[PDB]
């Protein structure tokens with residue numbers, strides 16, 4: 149791909165984070181804590197899952213960023229509507245306002261309803277995410293494999309401002325403590 153020139157500097161929004169997340173001082177890294185991180189509750193926080201949003205809101209244009217997923221066993225990445233549900237149980241789908249891919253139990257899948265199997269020959273250590281608001285496109289790229297395409301959601305019905313979306317995943321196994329990191333431009 150040649151989308152690199154639409155690079156945007158994403159930072160994480162502490163106020164949206166699940167209460168067990170630890171966001172770095174620079175707001176560019178997030179990981180699972182081993183307990184509640186001693187914050188007040190609020191209506192923005194994802195309650196059921198280890199999720200957080202970027203601070204940036206996008207309603208037009210072309211945007212690109214990259215995320216480091218090195219040595220994680222489970223995560224979700226993409227974009228979502230600013231108005232997505234925060235509390236209780238929900239599935240990641242375009243009907244619920246999410247355009248995402250994930251790693252879970254040694255397979256990669258796109259968050260369609262029902263989910264779509266991804267075909268990745270080189271397990272990625274860094275993921276590129278491209279959003280074209282006007283075109284209704286969200287695309288995912290394998291930076292480890294020379295930028296190869298992972299998945300394109302097209303005919304997207306955003307229906308509102310978009311936010312970068314992250315899930316560090318559970319760490320029941322003791323093998324998923326590593327952070328998500330926003331990679332430098």
Ligand SMILES: C[C@@H](NS(C)(=O)=O)c1ccccc1Cl
Nearest residue numbers: 166168196197198318319320
């Ligand atoms: C299960 C728990 N911690 S962990 C490290 O994954 O065992 C958790 C932490 C944050 C949100 C939901 C849940 Cl369920």
